[PDB]
Structure formats: C-alpha cells, structure tokens
Design a binder for this molecule. Structure first.
Ligand code: HEC
Length: 303
C-alpha cells in the first residue's frame, strides 16, 4: 500500500526449530550470509550505506519462499485478520530461513524512512532498536555464542512530517514486532531445552540472544508509540469522510506473540538455573523484560 512492503512473508512460529542444533543446521548458513552482508566494508559509515548493504544482501540471497501457506487448520480468523491487518502472509518453506528474510525485509523497511526523513527517536533507544537485528542475525549465524554488538549509525533529526509517514512507521514497525517476536521465541525455546539437557554454555548464549532481542523490542515499542502519538495528532482534523482507522492488533492473540509468551512462561526455572550457575544475564533480562512490558503503554490498545 506504499506505506509498507506487502505482502510481508513470514514463517509459521509453531514450526520454529526448538533446539540449538536443529536451529544451526537449518538457519546458520543463511544467517551468516546476512551477517556478512550487513558488515561488509563501508556498510556502517552512515545510515545510507547500511540500507544499500541490506538490499545487496537479500538480493544476493537465493529466496526460499515456497509460496503462501494457504489452508492452515491451526490458524484462527483472530490470527488471520490480525495477519491481514498488517499485510502479513504466512509462507511455506524453511521457517527459520524465512525469519532471516523477514528480518532483512523489515529492517530495510525501517531504514527507508530514516534515510529520507531521519528519526526523532532518542539516539540511545535507536541503538537497541536496530541492535535487535544484529542480535537476531548474529545469534542465528552462531546459536552457540552470544552475539557481539556491532556499530549502528545514527539517524538524522526528524524532518518534515509527510502525510501519514507516522502510518508508514506504524505498519513497518509492526513487521519488526513479528520478526523480533519469532526470534525471541527461539532463544527462549533453546534456553529451555539447553537448561533441561544440562547445556550450560548453550543456555548462556540463548539467554544472551533473548535479552538483546528483548531490549530490541523495547526500542521497537518506543518506535511504535512515536508513530502512534504522531498518529493521534494527525487526527485532530475533522474529516467529512469516514475517518479511516489505523490498523490495530486485536488483543494478545497474534500468532508470533502467542508463541513468545508461551515460551517465556515455563522458561522460569531456566532463568533461576542460570542465576544459580553464576550467570549475569538473568538480572539484565528481567530489566529488559520490565522495560518492554512498560513500553506497551501508548502502543497496544488493550493496554
Ligand atoms: C497489543 C496487541 C500488543 C502488542 C503490539 C504487543 N503486545 Fe505483548 N502483551 C499484550 C498483552 C495484552 C499482554 C498481557 C498484559 C497483561 O496480562 O497484563 C502482553 C504481554 C507481554 C509480555 C509478558 C509475558 C509474560 O508476562 O509472561 C511480554 C514479554 C510481551 N507481551 C512482549 C511483547 C513484545 C516483545 C512485543 C513487540 C514485538 C509486544 N509484546 C507487542 C499485547 C501486545
């Protein structure tokens, strides 16, 4: 709809790999490709070369999309209308590798607006918001080491508010939601599995990935509210037409979010287990966890 790239191809979060070995054999080859693309020389000089690097990468990548899913018996209309509302199409194929394409696609969508018209988001919140991609792809490239944070160029100050540019950031922002939700769902399932199997190094890396993905979602919720408050201001005009409403998420029941909170639940005993074995991630995660829950205010309706 010229506000976001549609359809946004995405995997079924239920089919996501569940253990650190199944994740690596499935996604580490395509993720490491994407990591090499987003850190090739010159790509981090400014925000412009980062967008060009994002496009060269996903262009070079052999697309894995085996078409739309279609007849899905596990999908409800509460999931479908929620998927339609933001142009999401569930796509057949390597679900983990699709998450790599969705990440590269959603990031490029965020980078277009910030190159033409900058961003009034704080330079500290801007970092964790983009670093969530570096976290996801860096960890997907090597699910057994904590991802090391790379440099993220700044954004210019917010230029002239173009018509419904806060709507472009509202739809393009919700794609980052489902991208980062699936990723954080992985690192929790791997943390749960590694903990039960006595994989202490694997538990540490998965927790580190989940935390940087949680901090990356907090910055995604600030970016969302920045565009929703700017939306609330854009509607003081009395409109003789029926006032077209911004697409909203219909309650907690969007698919990737349903999976992530189920993963987060029942992962309780693993976080306490990491804290006992001398880890420092259990503390800084609960920080990012509460920071993210607070950041729903101003973004989610039923909230
Ligand atoms: C509106 C729909 C949203 C959107 C845009 C996001 N979340 Fe979620 N979330 C939502 C609700 C209604 C609730 C329950 C609130 C309550 O019961 O008081 C939640 C809860 C969470 C949680 C807590 C999980 C738990 O307590 O076990 C987390 C961690 C969470 N939500 C994460 C999250 C992230 C990372 C989002 C951006 C991708 C996000 N939410 C968006 C509803 C909504």
């Amino acid at each position: 709809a010229q506000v976001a790239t549609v359809p946004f191809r995405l995997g079924r979060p239920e089919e996501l790999p569940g253990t650190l070995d199944e994740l690596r054999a499935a996604v580490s080859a395509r993720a490491g490709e994407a990591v090499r693309g987003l850190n090739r020389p010159g790509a981090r000089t400014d925000l412009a070369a980062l967008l060009a690097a994002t496009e060269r990468t996903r262009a070079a990548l052999a697309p894995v999309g085996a078409g739309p899913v279609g007849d899905d018996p596990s999908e409800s209309e509460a999931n479908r209308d929620n998927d339609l509302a933001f142009g999401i199409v569930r796509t057949r194929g390597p679900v983990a590798e699709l998450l790599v394409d969705a990440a590269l696609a959603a990031l490029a969508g965020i980078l277009e607006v910030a190159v033409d018209r900058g961003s009034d988001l704080e330079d500290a919140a801007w970092q964790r918001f983009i670093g969530g991609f570096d976290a996801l792809l860096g960890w997907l490239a090597d699910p057994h080491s904590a991802p090391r944070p790379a440099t993220v160029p700044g954004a210019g100050p917010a230029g002239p508010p173009v018509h419904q540019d806060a709507l472009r950031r509202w739809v393009r922002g919700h794609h980052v939601f489902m991208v980062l939700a699936q990723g954080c769902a992985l690192a929790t399932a791997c943390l749960r599995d590694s903990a039960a199997r006595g994989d202490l190094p694997g538990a540490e890396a998965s927790a580190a990935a989940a935390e940087a993905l949680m901090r990356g979602c907090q910055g995604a919720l600030l970016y969302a509210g920045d565009a929703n408050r700017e939306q609330y201001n854009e509607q003081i005009r009395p409109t003789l037409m029926p006032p077209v409403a911004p697409p909203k998420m219909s309650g907690l029941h969007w698919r990737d979010h349903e999976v992530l909170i189920k993963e987060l639940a029942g992962s309780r005993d693993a976080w306490e287990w990491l804290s006992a074995q001398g880890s420092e991630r259990p503390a800084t995660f609960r920080a990012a966890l509460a920071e993210t829950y607070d950041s729903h205010i101003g973004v989610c309706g039923h909230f």
